[PDB]
Design a protein around this ligand. Sequence first.
Ligand code: MET
Length: 521
Amino acid sequence: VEKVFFVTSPIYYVNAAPHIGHVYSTLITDVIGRYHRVKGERVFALTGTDEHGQKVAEAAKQKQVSPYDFTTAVAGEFKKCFEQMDYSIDYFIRTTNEQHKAVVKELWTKLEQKGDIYLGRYEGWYSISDESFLTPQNITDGVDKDGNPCKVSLESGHVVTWVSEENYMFRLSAFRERLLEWYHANPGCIVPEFRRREVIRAVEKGLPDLSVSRARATLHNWAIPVPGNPDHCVYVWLDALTNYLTGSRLRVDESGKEVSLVDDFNELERFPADVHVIGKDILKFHAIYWPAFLLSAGLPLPKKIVAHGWWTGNVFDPVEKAEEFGYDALKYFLLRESGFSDDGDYSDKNMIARLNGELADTLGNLVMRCTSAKINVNGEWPSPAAYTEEDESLIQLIKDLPGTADHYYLIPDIQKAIIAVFDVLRAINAYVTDMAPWKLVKTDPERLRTVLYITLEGVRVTTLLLSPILPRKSVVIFDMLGVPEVHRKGIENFEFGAVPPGTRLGPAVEGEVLFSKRSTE
Ligand code: MET
């Protein structure tokens, strides 16, 4: 079925400034969105901030300022940071938005009408910092900031406290079998596979019911009132998850401002999300709670949840590192170095090794070679002569690359897509070295035509596929290659030979380098 490809990041708590973790999750969301745009699809990419709850309200109290002002100031910080990181996100959502609250109330009301909400009690541990309910098995002994003995979450290491409250309870226990059916019937719905196995293990053990409201005093009245009961507030996480449904129902003007909430999500053709990007820290909320809420309400479920390895004396500032090494380079590094296990070396030394090694030497040198006046004497795509077997071995690698990369982008596993494209770039370099086109200018012009054509076309296709990762630099490369705009996107242009011979290269500049090398100081 044809619809808008809907890709989301988590909405981030605004208790503190944005940092690398927030940027990384939103980068992944951005890359996925961008790849689907390049394929010619309609996309709606969504990020935002999670502004209610006890965590945020008590952070605003520490700063001695009103939650309203505090949340707006920090959300400002997020917005500015994401603008400066040069994403292409379609909307930024805030849970303090009035339309969002309307949607939270309608959803809540559906759960109640369905019979899946009753008045009960929660008596147990709670992590305010994770806004998470924990069983006694998930807490251990530790210290607080006053050095006194306390209890801490096994999940996150954060301080836990005992909560004994009359709360509205959601009948999560009744969604065990349907969730198990869903995981089993859609074995790609949670990525990577080992996190899918975790979720199934947990749900197999049994599910308790879930507190979805809290007494208003505990939350400092900084939350959404429960419809029909002003003494209770809606659980920050039920509120937070609904943002995906709210975003799917907002009409957004050119300015990026919400101008309307539609009654029915089908009108905008976004819901349910094709991909929810998250950190491992918030797996349970997205793979257990959220689909249970959707199942109760009669709403379609998401298609994929991808959980990366990060957690949503030493600092690594995203913008500070981008000014020094480059936005596109920094974004490449983050996506190249980081798998799903997240055992990443994020040092300056490794960043410089990849910039010099892969971007400068593998990609950059290749672009300069096939565009330089010394090799491409006529500043144009030449017409190839007959191909040798060695020529065709390379052409086949280039031909197969789009189908392979496409699969990786769709898992989604951006690291694997990047490695595959550089696998092909490495081969093109090896081919170029093998053919020494610098010599051929004299020896054999006809042969030089063939080699050059295959190289340009290899650089174009690899670059098209790397354009979601390197949005600005891909444009520079296409400019240099003289690739018309029509050919810079669309699945028609993954095909080998889409740019006809005779196409003229873009103009040159004296100092032009794509990625300049940096010393190993
Ligand atoms: C519905 S996503 C909510 C995520 C939460 N605000 C966090 O920062 O982990």
